[PDB]
């Protein structure tokens, strides 16, 4: 059963087991059942924890439903993969990645007086090749001022840092000024449109490069696992995989009464059905009652 | 797809492009005379301009029917296409069973013959293990959990270092 | 047995989704 915070997150979900639970709930509602009350409770930390653990239940069947574009030619499968991850994030209740990680930056730095604690507390979300390049520039302006560079904006002890940090940002490879002009906006729509159309070219470059780096790392991990696997003899392979499969079955069979254990063994039985159904008619595929 | 589509019988295909299936339509003032044939069959039906607009009313909404996942089948497909590139260089192995006769036994040094028989045994090991294709479906399950945990992010499923860097410039170079 | 569905066969199988749900079911009544 769903707990009505379960089902409000699954209305915009499009995976299978979320949609059948939504449809069973609505077919319960049509047959003379009332909705329960929505909790106007659970203050901000519990609300954030609930949306964190409810976004993951929308993301986790959605990540498994997205085909990786491994071993592909052209950037259009990488753009398919990144657009599918974008759509899954939007279905799970996230915003655009830019808005969401900017919100994470502003959440981690509400206490920030200096740029040193900015560059040290957002270290988990900025790459080391950029955090070190901004740390050395903060140290270069700190050697000039001989006073701590503070996080003010109007203080030009900050601006002597920021004019070189923009140079670091343009030496990384990313156009900082069109990003600042996009998230600063403009008055007339015709002059903000021409810079949004440049920001979106940067944005497509950036998310395609991130998805491509993830795909190339998955390709390298698959090739490493295969070349370590093709060095074994066959009986070693069979007993290793059979031992791992047997241990992973017994870890879900010693779990009795947990929902994930029954779902695990039901999916094992569904895989065995798939194997039997393609053994029944191998030219037609599995039997789908349409 | 959207709930409203605006395609059909206006700038439609008036001809087919292959040699395998023959299409010709007579787009009249109201309707169309569509008559198609593909080899041994004939088909001549009548569609109106509002008959194709009713076609996108209910969507087909195709979906993959996978053994485990679409993700897992993509990783297994890449492992199969990598096993193909290893099997292609096991297809270029020189035939050692042309030198199994006793002409090559007794002309040859005993240590070099034992090395040649070890090389043949090694090719049989490599070929028995590159064609164990029932092991790729469990090899793909070792790429799946680490990848899925990397996508199960506190920020965004599609976040990466470049977007986070650009947002760090926008957060940093704007005021405070 | 034979010819299950389409909506039953569209499910990704060994996703977490229920270990996540088990943690969020044992966690939120414990943290409230």
């Amino acid at each position: 059963a769903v707990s009505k915070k379960e089902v409000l997150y699954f209305l915009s979900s499009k995976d299978a087991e979320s949609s059948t639970a939504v449809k069973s709930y609505l077919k319960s509602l049509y047959a003379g059942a009332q909705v329960e009350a929505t909790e106007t409770d659970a203050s901000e930390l519990i609300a954030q924890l609930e949306k964190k653990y409810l976004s993951a239940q929308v993301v986790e069947p959605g990540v498994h439903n997205i085909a990786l574009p491994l071993g592909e030619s052209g950037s259009a499968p990488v753009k398919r993969y990144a657009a599918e991850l974008f759509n899954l994030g939007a279905q799970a209740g996230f915003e655009c990645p830019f808005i969401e990680v900017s919100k994470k930056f502003g959440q981690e730095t509400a206490t920030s007086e200096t740029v040193k604690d900015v560059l040290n507390k957002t270290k988990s979300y900025v790459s080391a090749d950029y955090n070190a390049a901004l740390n050395e520039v903060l140290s270069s302006v700190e050697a000039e001022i001989n006073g701590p560079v503070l996080f003010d904006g109007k203080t030009e002890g900050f601006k002597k840092f920021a004019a070189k940090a923009k140079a670091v940002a343009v030496s990384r490879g990313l156009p900082a000024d069109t990003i600042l002009a996009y998230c600063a906006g403009s008055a007339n729509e015709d002059a903000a449109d021409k810079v949004s159309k440049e920001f979106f070219t940067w944005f497509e470059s950036a998310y395609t490069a991130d998805a491509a780096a993830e795909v190339k790392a998955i390709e390298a991990e698959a090739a490493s696992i295969l070349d370590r696997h093709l060095a074994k003899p066959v009986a070693q392979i069979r007993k290793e995989q059979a031992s791992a499969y047997a241990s992973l079955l017994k870890r879900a069979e010693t779990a009795k009464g947990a929902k994930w254990a029954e779902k695990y063994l039901e999916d094992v039985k569904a895989v065995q059905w798939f194997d039997a159904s393609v053994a029944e008619a191998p030219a037609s595929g599995p039997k789908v009652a349409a | 797809l959207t709930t409203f589509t605006f395609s059909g019988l206006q700038d439609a295909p008036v001809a087919a492009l292959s040699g395998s299936i023959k299409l010709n339509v007579a787009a009249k003032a109201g309707k169309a005379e569509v008559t198609v044939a593909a080899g041994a069959a004939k088909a001549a039906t009548q569609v109106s301009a509002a008959a194709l607009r009713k076609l996108s009313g209910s969507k087909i909404s195709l979906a993959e029917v996978a053994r485990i996942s679409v993700l897992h089948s993509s990783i297994q497909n890449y492992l199969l296409s990598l096993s193909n590139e290893r099997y292609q260089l096991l297809s270029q192995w020189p035939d050692f069973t042309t030198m199994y006769g006793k002409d090559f036994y007794y002309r040859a040094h005993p240590e070099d013959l034992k090395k040649f028989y070890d090389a043949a045994d090694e090719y049989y090991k490599l070929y028995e293990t590159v064609t164990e294709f029932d092991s790729l479906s469990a090899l793909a399950s070792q790429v799946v959990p680490n990848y899925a945990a990397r996508r199960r992010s506190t920020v965004h499923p599609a976040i990466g270092s470049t977007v986070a860097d650009g947002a760090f410039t926008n957060f940093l170079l704007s005021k405070q | 047995a034979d010819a299950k569905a389409l909506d039953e066969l569209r499910k990704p199988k060994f996703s977490s989704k229920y270990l996540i749900q088990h943690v969020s079911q044992k966690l939120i009544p414990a943290v409230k």
């Binding site: 964190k52 993951a56 990680v101 988990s124 979300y125 900025v126 790459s127 780096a213 993830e214 190339k216 790392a217 998955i218 390298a220 991990e221 090739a223 490493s224 070349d227 370590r228 093709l230 060095a231 499969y245 992973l248 079955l249 870890r251 994930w260 695990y264 094992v268 895989v271 | 053994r67 485990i68 290893r86 260089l89 096991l90 490599l126 479906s137 469990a138 399950s141 070792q142 799946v144 959990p145 899925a148 945990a149 990397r150 996508r151 199960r152 992010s153 506190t154 920020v155 976040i159 990466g160 270092s161 986070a164 | 060994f14 977490s16 229920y18 270990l19 996540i20 088990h22 943690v23």
Partner: peptide
Amino acid sequence: YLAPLRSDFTEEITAPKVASASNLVNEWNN
């Protein structure tokens, strides 16, 4: 064919750690 289930979150935003290309093509060519 099946994997262990994990319930944890990636807090960082890091580089995806491209692994080392193994020597199997050059070793089998040898």
